[PDB]
Amino acid sequence: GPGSMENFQKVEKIGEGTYGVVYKARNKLTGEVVALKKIRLDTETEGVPSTAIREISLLKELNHPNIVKLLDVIHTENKLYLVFEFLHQDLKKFMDASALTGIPLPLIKSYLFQLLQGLAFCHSHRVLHRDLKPQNLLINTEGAIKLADFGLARAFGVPVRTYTHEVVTLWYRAPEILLGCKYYSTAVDIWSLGCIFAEMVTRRALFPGDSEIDQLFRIFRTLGTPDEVVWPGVTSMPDYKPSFPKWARQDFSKVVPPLDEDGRSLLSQMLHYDPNKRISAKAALAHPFFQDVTKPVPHLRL
Amino acid sequence: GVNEVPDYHEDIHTYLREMEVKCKPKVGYMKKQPDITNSMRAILVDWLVEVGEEYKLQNETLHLAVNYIDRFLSSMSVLRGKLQLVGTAAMLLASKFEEIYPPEVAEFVYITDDTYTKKQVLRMEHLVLKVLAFDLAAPTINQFLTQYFLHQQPANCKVESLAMFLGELSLIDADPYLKYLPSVIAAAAFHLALYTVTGQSWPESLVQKTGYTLETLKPCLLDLHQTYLRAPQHAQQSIREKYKNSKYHGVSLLNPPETLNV
Ligand SMILES: O=C(O)Cn1cc(Br)cn1
Ligand SMILES: O=C(O)Cn1cc(Br)cn1
Ligand SMILES: O=C(O)Cn1cc(Br)cn1
């Protein structure tokens, strides 16, 4: 692809992960500010990590204004540099630093609408994210929000096959995964966004569990313990146990009291137990909750 | 329901159709290969079938690997003593992409019987990535077959397995199958299996989705029916062995039709 390391100037470190360090960087010829994710392959006697193969292969084909753009890949013998579009902040830091009295309802609507666009786009292209949480949603100065971190993403077939069970950060993880179901689909990313929607309203995670069984229990205490009526097949699921306490479902008015009828309607459809009835991103874009979103769709960049 | 992605299957189908054209190997690549032949490639792919079986890999992984190999050999000229190395790195890559639990590089080194070092496998991995520009999310026959299967009324596991079998046979023989798109081979495979097992034909509903007809699918279908008929005689037998297994409903033991009445 276009680039080499000689044309970038490092500005500061901005994060890290498995792969290694991320830097804010400046293209010395064009002026473009980028994020450079370094992957070390020399320490890797397992070759190029699968996480990076998926991240690159899948992001190459996902050009959408609400998906962080992979601009280039610089492939040395020794190292691998992913050049990304730069965005100054994530939703977690925003909600933790500037949203202490709250995120205003206009900005929530806008964010959720944009997130749904990006997600629908992923699902339209055979791609599950499997790691949607505030930390992985980058915001820029223009008010765009974008899906990031495809390290845990996966190309799916139709219908889906059994994929990895260790998927999704626990607080954001769908009941169907927690219950060890053989198959999971696009509804798991919708669950995550449901959790995030609630989080944006309250500035606190909706299901903050410390264990898989605690995560389930917290979910059940909010949405009621699922039975055959609400979720056919539930009581046959591999890690479903008859012993599960049977908590009553509570009114969504109590789950997120500041939310209005439209918001509560959308949220409930995002958090439906049965994955088959859970709303799709594509359908959710038309929900009345969004009737008054004003933001010009962001532009897809080069 | 959601596992068959009702709200996205069309978008995905359409997107795979576009991609299969982008990921297509050069049909004439083998004549321009000075030192390798269709026969060598058949040997290789048959070996990859065995490797897949040995490490209990997904069949998707197999199709992906063959896709990487054919694209690779479309731009890169390879001596016969290195073809296996290309194939090995392809299988590694596909494994890392598609498998929950990919085999280790050492296992890939081991299956080559010390022909190649770990360093050579990893260097070739890098080369293949370079050559394909990390474009690894390739449409496969399987990705089309599984969608077509949703149009069976009702589902037959013998039909589904037989179709898989036929599609896999197609991977072995670059002539003629390099000239057909995954979606077309899958269409032929599906029709042939359905005819073989239930006597029925390529459904109207699949014409409405693919735009394909028995007419449009006829060239491939004639080639595929020959491959099915001559399969017990082929030099390469690993697919037939694999599909005797109960896992795939012993479908390699079914008798091909003598005619298609097309
Ligand atoms: O990675 C290197 O050693 C070279 N380089 C770093 C930046 Br930021 C831009 N170029
Ligand atoms: O033994 C050779 O050099 C020829 N050959 C290589 C493969 Br892989 C298959 N045939
Ligand atoms: O079967 C083996 O273990 C050796 N082999 C490699 C190829 Br290509 C074909 N045979």
CATH superfamily of A89-299: Transferase(Phosphotransferase) domain 1 (1.10.510.10)
Report yes or no: A158 at the B interface, CB cutoff 8 Å.
yes
Among candidate residues A42, A72, A96, A131, the one labeled active-site is A131
Q: For chain A, give every domain's residue range.
A: 5-88, 89-299
Contact call for residues A85 and A71 (beta carbons, < 8 A): yes
Clarify whether residues B65 and B184 are in a common domain.
Answer: no
In angstroms, the Cα distances linking B239 to B59, B63, B132, B174 are 11, 13, 27, 16
Domain identity same for B128 and B206: no
Q: Which of residues B137, B163, B184 is at a domain's end?
A: B137
CATH number of A5-88: 3.30.200.20
Decide if B6 is inside a domain.
no
- Examine residue B240 and state whether it is found in any structural domain, yes or no: yes
Cα separations (Å) of B163 from B146, B152, B189, B239?
10, 12, 5, 13
Q: What six digits make up the tokens of A211?
A: 């264990």
- B42 shares a domain with B20: no
Nearest CA to ligand 2 atom 10: B40
Please report whether residue B2 resides in a domain. Answer: no
Ligand nearest to the CA of A26: 1
Hey, is A138 helix, strand or coil?
A: strand
Report chain B residues whose CB lies below 8 A from the CB of A125: 11-12, 15
Q: How far is CA A294 from the centre of its chain?
A: 23
Q: Is A294 annotated as a binding residue?
A: no
Single-letter code of the amino acid located at A28: K
Q: Is the domain of B16 the same as that of B48?
A: no
Whether residue B164 is found in the same domain as residue B231: yes
Residue B228 CA to residue A51 CA, distance in Å, equals: 39
Q: What's the one-letter identity of residue A64?
A: H
Of the residues B91, B112, B137, which one is the last residue of a structural domain? Answer: B137
Q: Which ligand is nearest to the CA of B236?
A: 3
Q: Is the domain of B170 the same as that of B182? A: yes
Q: Is the backbone of residue A193 left (phi > 0), alpha (psi -120 to 50) or beta?
A: alpha
Strands A154-155 and A127-128, bridge-based pairing: antiparallel
B108 and B88 share one domain: yes
Q: How was this structure determined?
A: X-ray
Total domains in the fold of chain B:
2
- Residues spanned by the domain of B219: 11-24+138-262
Instruction: With H, G, I as helix, E, B as strand and everything else as coil, classify residue B173.
Output: coil
Bridge-based pairing of strands A137-139 and A89-90 is: antiparallel
Q: Which residues pair with A83 in a beta bridge?
A: A36, A72
The DSSP annotation for B128-183 comes to HHHHHTT------HHHHHHHHHTT-SS--HHHHHHHHHHHHHHTT-HHHHTTS-HH
B252 and B145 share a domain? yes
Residue B152: CB atoms within 10 A of its CB come to: 19
B20 and B142 within one domain? yes
- The tokens of A37 are what? 């994710």
Q: Is A160 annotated as a binding residue?
A: no
**CA of A3 relative to ligand 1 center, distance in Å:** 12
- Whether A126 has its CB under 8 Å from any CB of chain B: the answer is yes
The CATH number covering residue B161 comes to 1.10.472.10
Domain's final residue, options B109, B137, B165? B137
Residues with C-beta less than 6 Å from any ligand 2 atom? B 40, 43-44, 80-81, 83-84
What amino acid occupies position B219?
P
- Annotate A146-187 with DSSP letters as a single string: EE---TT-EE--SS-----SS-S-GGG--HHHHTT-S---TH
Question: Do B223 and B198 share a domain, yes or no?
Answer: yes
Looking at the fold, whether B57 and B157 belong to one and the same domain comes out as no
Task: Please indicate, yes or no, whether residues B143 and B245 belong to a single structural domain of this protein.
Answer: yes
Residue B5 belongs to a domain = no
**Resolution reached, in Å?**
2.4
